[PDB]
Amino acid sequence: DRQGSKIRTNIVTLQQKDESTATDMRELLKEEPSIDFGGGNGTSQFLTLRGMGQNSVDIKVDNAYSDSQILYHQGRFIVDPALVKVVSVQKGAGSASAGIGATNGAIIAKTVDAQDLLKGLDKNWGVRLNSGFASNEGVSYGASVFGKEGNFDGLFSYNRNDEKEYEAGKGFRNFNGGKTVPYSALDKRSYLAKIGTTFGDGDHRIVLSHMEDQHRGIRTVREEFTVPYRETTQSNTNLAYTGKDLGFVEKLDANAYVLEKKRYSADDKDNGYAGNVVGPNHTRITTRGMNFNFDSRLAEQTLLKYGINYRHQEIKPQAFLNGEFEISTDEEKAKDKKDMDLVHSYKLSNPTKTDTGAYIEAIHELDGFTLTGGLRYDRFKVKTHDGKTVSSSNLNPSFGVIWQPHEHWSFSSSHNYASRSPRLYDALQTHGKRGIISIADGTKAERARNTEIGFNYNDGTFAANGSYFWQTIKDALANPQNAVREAVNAGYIKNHGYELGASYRTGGLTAKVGVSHSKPRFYDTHPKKLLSANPEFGAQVGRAWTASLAYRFQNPNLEIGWRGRYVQKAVGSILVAGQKDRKLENVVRKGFGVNDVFANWKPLGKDTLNVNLSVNNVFNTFYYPHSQRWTNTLPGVGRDVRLGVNYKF
Question: Start and end of every TonB-dependent receptor-like beta-barrel domain (predicted)?
């Protein structure tokens, strides 16, 4: 890692996850101050990265990701850590070779492999069982089988986490006076099947994989708020190839995938967003993509990278419902009449979006000085649900340097352009009951320019890093203009800020500190101000501080520690123009402090058996996280005690 805080790779590792009691990403990455999560369970949660929300930050798993969503009242699906081997972060705009839509960062995850599960074992196959118990409130378990034979390796993994409704901190009251947050229960299931082969004497690898992650339970219409049975599923079929030494190509990595997001309601009758479909309602989003990334060496320490990005998205609702379209103290209803007339007339099909990218990037190194320059060609085609098409393309130039004058020090900067194509409207509303959703003529991709400085220090005992970033996004899209409404570029986004992290390690003691603060501001340049305060776009998070102190005893092999996360009071909407209720809102978010303690115990002295115990939110603090609407939606989890065990043999 040499870009300051810009890029943190292996923020969490499998051997680290085994020592933790966490069963979602929100807890796993709680010590990372520039990532903030909303309250609530499952897709109740909204994620922000430097204050920017999932409308711009992807979650990439095995290099497949989609940018469409189910509905704006819930966060985009966040993957279950049980499946992953490694999680990394990339903030701001990426260089040429990053992929499509790299305007703000991405959480990047890679699924587990037989090789990682075999890590503590004396042989080429194993089983892993695990169990977890949460006081507030859930039980989880899982099993895996895996191995490596000759050049083959394979894994099958199953995990379930059944959680009841959680209760919030001292002083929260239900709508009927309980402690629990209503409809916050989810029965989460995930499995992963993966086969892989290496051949060509070690130079080639093919991995085929299938993954499902599924949430099921009784869930509200708007998952972001509390007061029918639902199943929300993310599936991934992935083929990935890695070859080296292919004549003039030093390294090629390609993947191809199909990503399915499914929402199933048992009965949508009372869901206007879903059309009030009576009985089962199925909504699907299908993403296909391929990536080819090539590396050719030009000289002993200059690498050239080039490749191709293809992504196809298709939203497929159960049926269209525009014909049911309809409009509510009046006297000029003449107009309303002509409209319904107009919408009923429409012959809706499945909205789609193709994103196409080629890029070329040069990396030249000489005696500690690394220069990186690159260019991307990004092309989109968007087909809204009225058959109406619209394309654009952009050239995106990027460069950065890494300067390493001394083995303990590095300094960095980058200035990157990147573009992101307009997102298709909420999948769950694609039927059009509520209106036509078109796209305006010549509407372009959002264009980010990201510049940052950073530094990294490490002497094997003390480590530190910092970043400062500035970002401008031109042609931001939020709401559609004039109902046949259409997607338009409606203003620009500015963001700036910093993050610092430091750490200390001597003889079993580990101490870390972090701080992050950003200022995401959305500027309206369109008469009927179409920019949105929805958490999807982002939130003004208060300055976030994290720290931990942990000590590991030699006998028995045991770690105990404390962890803490403090966020300061924030004020202001992300909208420069101000955000409105149903009057301008004067946004203020109380700050809060959360404290955890945890223990990891390895009875065998090795990584094959972990016994973990933690008490999260020890003071049973009642608070609302900032990455969500400010009107006290979903509080954080109160005191939660956990006991987990994982075991490999």
Answer: 228-618
The angle formed by the CA atoms of residues 462, 28 and 265, to the nearest 5 degrees, is 160
Structure tokens at 538: 């982002």
Pick from 487, 534, 265, 275: which is nearest to 385 by CA? 487
DSSP string, 195-246: EEEEEGGGTEEEEEEEEEEEEEEE--SSTT----EEEEEEEEEEEEEEEEEE
> How far is Cα 649 from Cα 631, in angstroms, rounded to an integer?
49
- Say whether both 306 and 363 belong to one domain: yes
* Same structural domain, 105 and 122: no
CATH number at residue 91: 2.170.130.10
Pairing of strands 84-90, 106-111: antiparallel
Mode of pairing for the β-strands spanning 436-439 and 484-506: parallel
Q: What is the CA radius of gyration of the chain?
A: 25
d(CA 11, CA 5): 11
Element (H, E) at 401: strand 389-406
CB 480 within 8 A of CB 18: no
Tell me, yes or no, whether 66 and 198 share the same domain.
Answer: no
216/96 same-domain check: no
* Contact assessment for residue 218 and residue 201, using Cβ atoms and an 8 Å cutoff: no
Going by C-alpha positions, the residue among 16, 34, 12, 83 that lies closest to residue 468 is 34
How many C-beta atoms lie closer than 10 Å to residue 391's C-beta? 14
How far is Cα 23 from Cα 9, in angstroms, rounded to an integer?
Answer: 20
Residue 63 gets which letter from DSSP? T
Reported in sequence order, the residue ranges of 443-532 that DSSP labels E, i.e. its strands, are 446-458, 462-481, 484-506, 509-518, 521-524
Residues 329 and 398 in one domain: yes
Domain final residue, candidates 111, 140, 165:
111
Q: Are 138 and 162 in contact (CB under 8 A)?
A: yes
CATH number at residue 190: 2.40.170.20
Q: Three-class SS string for 254-319?
A: EEEEEEEEEEEECCCCCCCCCCCCCCCEEEEEEEEEEEEEEEEEEECCEEEEEEEEEEEEEEEECC
| Residue whose tokens read 């977890």 | 132
Q: Solving technique for this entry?
A: X-ray
- Nearest-angstrom CA–CA distance, 504 and 601: 22
- The residues, any chain, with a CB within 8 Å of residue 514's CB and separated by 6 or more, are 31, 32, 33, 499, 500, 501, 502, 544, 545, 546, 547
Q: How many CB atoms lie within 10 A of CB 485?
A: 18
* H helices, E strands: number in the chain: 4, 32
Classify the C-alpha dihedral 590-591-595-596 as positive or negative: positive
The boundaries of the domain holding residue 413 are: 112-649
Query: Do 320 and 441 sit in the same domain of this protein?
Result: yes
Cβ–Cβ under 8 Å, residues 595 and 576: no
CA-based end-to-end distance of the chain: 34
Shared-domain flag, residues 79 and 122: no
Among 55, 90, 111, the domain boundary falls at 111
Name the resolution in angstroms: 2.3
Same domain flag for 70 and 173: no
Sequence-separated (6 or more) residues with CB below 8 Å from residue 123 = none
Closest alpha carbon to 423 in 38, 54, 50: 54
- How far apart are the C-alpha atoms of 6 and 49, rounded to whole Å? 11
Structurally, the chain folds into a number of domains equal to 2
Q: Tell me how far apart the alpha carbons of residues 356 and 376 are, in angstroms, rounded to a whole number.
A: 10
352-366/229-246 β-pairing: unpaired
